[PDB]
Design a protein around this ligand. Sequence first.
Ligand SMILES: [Hg+2]
Lengths: 125, 125
Amino acid sequence: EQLTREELYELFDLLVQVPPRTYLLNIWNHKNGICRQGTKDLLKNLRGIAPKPPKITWQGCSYDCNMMVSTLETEQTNRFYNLLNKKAPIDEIKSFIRSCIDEFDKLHTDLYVKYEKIFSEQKLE
Amino acid sequence: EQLTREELYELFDLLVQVPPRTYLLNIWNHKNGICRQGTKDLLKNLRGIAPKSPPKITWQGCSYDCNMMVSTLETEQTNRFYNLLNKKAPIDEIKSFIRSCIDEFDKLHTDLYVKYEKIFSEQKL
Ligand SMILES: [Hg+2]
C-alpha cells in the first residue's frame, strides 16, 4: 500500500506527537518507495534520449546513476536511524524526511541534466 | 548582496520555524538572482556555438526564445510562491517548493542549451 508523496505529507500532519518507532520505520519505507520510483522514472527518461566528444555508453550512465542513488539512500537511512536514536522531536524528524526527498529530487535533477547534455552532444555530427 | 547557491541552500536548513514574510521575500530574491545568473551563463555558452528552405536560426531568434522561456517561468514560479505565502504554507512545504523551482530552472536551462546545440549543428551543413 505505497503512499504517494501527497499522502505522506498529509499524514505528516496527523503526527502531532512522535509516533512509535515501528510507525516511523513504516513511514521511511514509504519514503524509500517514493525515491526509488523517482530513480526508475529517471532511468526510463534517460533511456529514451540515450543514443543507439565523450563515448559514454548506456551501461556507464546506468552504473553512475545507480551508484549515486544507492549511496545516497544508505547515507540518508543512517542519518535517519541516528535521529531516531537521539529521540528527536517530531517536527525535526518530519523536516528531515521531507528534506531527504528534496535531496533525492535534486540528485535526480543533477543526473538528468548531466546525461541530457552528453547524450544530445553524442547524437550530433 | 547576492547569495551563492551554496549559501542559499545553507539558509534553508536554518529556517526551522516559519519566518517573517520579509525574510521569505528576501530568500526569493536570492533565488531569482541565482536563476538569472544561470540564464546569463546559458547565453554566454550559446554565443560560443552560434553562427557568425525554412528560415535560418540566428542569434537574435535564439536569444528571444530563451529570454521568453526563462522570463515566463520566472513569472509563473513567483505567482506560485505568493500563493503559498498567502495560504500560509508551512515552512517544510515552502522549502521544498523553492528547491523544486531551482531544479525546474536548471532543467529549463539544459533543455534550451540542448535545443540550440542541435539546431545550430544541423544548420552548419
Ligand atoms: Hg552547457
